[PDB]
Amino acid sequence: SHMGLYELSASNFELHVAQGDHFIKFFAPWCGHAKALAPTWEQLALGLEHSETVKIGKVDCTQHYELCSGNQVRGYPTLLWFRDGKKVDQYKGKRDLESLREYVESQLQ
């Protein structure tokens, strides 16, 4: 990771998400909604950078579009929870740091 934020690719995604809990931002750099989230997502990863039980990731859908499409990502940013290899949630709520952190807490219980 880079200060807690894992860059995921078609080459490493399956290995990465196979065990544990994961919160992953599927994004495109050209999309304003996605770009606006980037600093907050970095803060989220930073606060969790030493944790094993949750890992914060991102997938650039301009580089790995088939991985995005294969996970039914239809627009950016799409924020997905994976647990032990399986997509288990999509987070559609407010994208401030506190809301994201409280969601993470909810999902790790």
């Binding site: 050209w30 909604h33 239809r74 950016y76």
Partner: peptide, 7 residues
């Protein structure tokens, strides 16, 4: 909330 750019 939930706003996105379409793929």
């Amino acid at each position: 909330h939930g706003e996105v750019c379409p793929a």
